[PDB]
Design a protein around this ligand. Structure first.
Ligand SMILES: Cc1ncc(COP(=O)(O)O)c(CN[C@@H](COP(=O)(O)O)C(=O)O)c1O
Length: 382
């Protein structure tokens, strides 16, 4: 029998650790889930169903239910794109678009771009962990409280918009090299902004954010370490790639993407590899010395990509190459993607050129829109 999962969402605040992900993997592998006689007594199984995108739980004795029955494949978007409020727009206005590029890659690699700027608050993939993180906290943190984090730009914008929509104040910390939209748009959205010209990277800033958190008592939502980030992408980004691949008729052979906190690409690789373990994940390594906004090198400390049972391949990409790929996609598709999106197209093209990849459909997650990076666009034009 089926029950509405929204009833059982306290397992989100009681289950800890990654061991529940075994259940998520097996349900996705087998395409079905066993009924729970006492759902309240299996909180790991319930969390696993939420995390893969079920809206209903299987309840009863000996029965089982398919992904489709559990609502993994439910259509959420009203055909007419009308929404009673901004958060309902964020929630129901999904999947984000998956668009075949006209770009031709060597060796039968067909390229599809998943456009994460179609998120309403930061015009970036960072809306999704902001919403899930503030939502989970809205259960236990009193309204009016301050929330804060370190960001490269995007997550701090999404944080400021989302915290305000739920009744919280926000503070964002940024390094001096961050884009101007990152330092300015949070103030527009009513958040306090702290810029460190000394900080060379966003993780550099984490000790200061932690220290100020002890002194002032604000909630440090810590997108680097908060599992709600990874879980937002499992039930959003990754489940969409799966559902979009199936209903789209793609022969999905891999996904490509870039790593900041590593939340969205871990989710993508973990989720799809549960369904089919030969699916590649090609991941961008910014070249040592180079700064590509929003992203960073693996060895510098990433939670999910490291701890989860995920296969991936790295590719080194310089900022110059990322920008040449922004240029090619624009001229080829008329879409203007951000530097980290060009970096992932470039990483996929490298692997294609080397003969490493099966022919088929590859999805590239494009984190944001190039319109936000005019100085780098001007440099690339040269
Ligand atoms: C523009 C851009 N491109 C890629 C990413 C990577 O997503 P992840 O968190 O792996 O999921 C982001 C994410 N931006 C964060 C993190 O900045 P860091 O370099 O310290 O991870 C942000 O603060 O906005 C992004 O913005």
């Amino acid at each position: 029998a089926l029950a509405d999962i929204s009833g059982y969402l306290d397992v989100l605040d009681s289950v800890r650790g990654f061991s529940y992900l075994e259940n998520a993997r097996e349900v996705l592998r087998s395409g079905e889930a066993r009924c729970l006689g006492n759902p309240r007594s299996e909180p790991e199984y319930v969390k696993a169903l939420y995390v893969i995108g079920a809206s209903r739980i299987p309840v009863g004795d000996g029965c089982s239910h398919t992904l489709e029955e559990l609502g993994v494949f439910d259509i959420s978007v009203p055909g007419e794109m009308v929404f009673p409020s901004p958060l309902d727009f964020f929630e129901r206005g999904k999947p984000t678009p998956l668009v075949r590029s006209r770009l031709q890659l060597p060796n039968g690699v067909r390229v599809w771009l998943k456009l994460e700027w179609y998120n309403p608050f930061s015009l970036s993939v960072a809306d999704r962990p902001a919403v899930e993180i503030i939502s989970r906290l809205s259960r236990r943190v009193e309204k009016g409280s301050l929330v804060a984090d370190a960001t490269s730009s995007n997550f701090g914008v999404a944080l400021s918009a989302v915290a305000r929509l739920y009744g919280y104040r926000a503070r964002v910390y940024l390094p001096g090299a961050a884009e101007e939209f990152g330092k300015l748009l949070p103030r527009l959205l009513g958040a306090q902004v702290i810029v460190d010209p000394e900080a060379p990277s966003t993780v550099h800033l984490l000790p200061r954010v932690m220290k100020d958190s002890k002194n002032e008592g604000f909630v440090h939502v810590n997108q680097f370490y908060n599992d709600a980030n990874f879980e937002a992408h499992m039930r959003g980004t990754a489940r969409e790639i799966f559902v979009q691949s199936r209903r789209g008729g793609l022969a999905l052979r891999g996904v490509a993407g870039s790593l900041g906190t590593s939340g969205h690409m871990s989710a993508a690789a973990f989720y799809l590899q549960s369904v089919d373990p030969s699916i590649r994940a090609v991941l961008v390594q910014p070249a040592q010395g180079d700064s590509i906004p929003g992203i960073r090198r693996v060895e510098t400390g990433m939670l999910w990509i490291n701890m989860l049972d995920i296969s991936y391949t790295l590719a080194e990409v310089t900022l110059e190459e990322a920008m040449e790929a922004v240029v090619e996609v624009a001229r080829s598709d008329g879409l203007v993607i951000g530097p980290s999106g060009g970096a992932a197209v470039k990483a996929l093209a490298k692997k294609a050129a080397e003969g490493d990849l099966e022919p088929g459909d590859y999805v590239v997650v494009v984190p944001d829109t190039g319109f936000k990076y005019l100085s780098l666009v001007q440099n690339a034009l040269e």
